[PDB]
Amino acid sequence: PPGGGEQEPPPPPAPQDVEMKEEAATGGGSTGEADGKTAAAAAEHSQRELDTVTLEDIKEHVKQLEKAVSGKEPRFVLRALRMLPSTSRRLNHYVLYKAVQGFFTSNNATRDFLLPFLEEPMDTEADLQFRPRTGKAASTPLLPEVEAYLQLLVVIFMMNSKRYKEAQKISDDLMQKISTQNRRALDLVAAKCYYYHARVYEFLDKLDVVRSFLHARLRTATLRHDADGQATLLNLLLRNYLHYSLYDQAEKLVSKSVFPEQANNNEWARYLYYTGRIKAIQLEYSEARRTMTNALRKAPQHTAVGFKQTVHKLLIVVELLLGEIPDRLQFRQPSLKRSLMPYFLLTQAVRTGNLAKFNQVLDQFGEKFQADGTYTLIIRLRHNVIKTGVRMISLSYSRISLADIAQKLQLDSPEDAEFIVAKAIRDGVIEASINHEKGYVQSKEMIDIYSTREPQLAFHQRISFCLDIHNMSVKAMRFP
Amino acid sequence: DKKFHGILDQGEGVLIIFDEPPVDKTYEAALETIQNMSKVVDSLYNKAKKLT
């Protein structure tokens, strides 16, 4: 009781200090300015809801003795939130439940008491037509149930809480969704709950009847609103279709839903990456690396970014497949350095011409590549090792025996050492001829490449590109 | 020592002599502008990137 009564009594009110200022300012705003007048294309309540997801990601950790959040639920759920003269008593009810935690004891919600914390939208003239309240009054309890996820006989409490929000989601899909942004501000509440709708299901449940419900969700999308409904319903469509073998890749080629034209700078950034791997996994190399690069330089400024630990790995998988390689550790971190050393040792073998050096990696770190889920692209680098090597040898040696190149590439056979060189010319790596009767492979010396048209093609790509950024500097300037 | 330029042969001693002032003025005096302009965009960070 002294170790309790000095360390337990400040966890109730100082969260009550900041929760009368963040979602009470959201409840004070997004009931009267999302159901109210307007929250326009330049709104604040979405970014305010962006402020009330991230703060509560790392806010709550403990099972909430002293009712420091276990008493917030009997506070924050007895809410009509209809109009100002009936919420002037509710502005007292933000303080009337504070002494319920203090003078008395509330109901400590420890893994059992969430069932009398969900049935309240009948109590004291509550509604569901005001879904700028009730979609947020879903998400204000729907987040902290599932934020820790706590995975011990809880899943049904998360489910029935989603079912009441799914009842709000059907009223979203059918009933009066126009110019109140009832779809728009709840497409985020659709999108943000889907990740809590998935990590429940990616932990212990199925995946696929939600997909047909997501097709029914994609049905009404772009069918009433063409803003942030075309965007988040397609990355959340793709998120396990890539990991499954179902159709979902040539469908997304001819699909019209490729461009929502705006997706709020962070869901748009990874959007070019989930379809960036689709061209990577189905052999479309050169088209992929520009939507892989564009999916990199549109991401914000966080540090614990473990998906960015994957895109920097994957972006130069396909560039090893094309030949080009940048320095990958050019932004090396204390958390990037350990995530590069098996994969950086791979491209060490690629810039060399050795053949079973590839085999000395693929037995040492063959298990690591299957953890990242990338092995099926790794296995085909032996075509690109041998074309790197045959370009390397033909440029160095001019008149080399074909019964010498195989011993240097440890090919163990001169009789197909002619044959890779045949496919080197069929692909077009080296030009010159082979004296198959003698055995030497002669190469012609290069000639005046300066007086060829091809450096103008190095220019014309970049003349037209540099006039574009001068035009974009004009088009983005005179907003005043 | 580049006081004279040419080539020497080893088999029979043939000195193929050639000359051209190739070009120097056009490219490298336009190349150093690029690294001057790189430092200008670097100095744009001290009035734009810090500021807005």
């Binding site: 974009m472 500097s473 300037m477 | 965009v41 734009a48 500021l51």
Partner: peptide, 30 residues
């Protein structure tokens, strides 16, 4: 190619010259 490269940087320095006159007056004037 050099001269067009300069054209992009100059208008970008002009872009900050409008972002200095956009943000630093909405709090001042209103």
């Amino acid at each position: 190619y050099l001269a067009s490269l300069i054209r992009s940087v100059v208008a970008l320095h002009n872009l900050i010259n409008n972002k200095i006159a956009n943000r630093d007056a909405e709090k001042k004037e209103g």
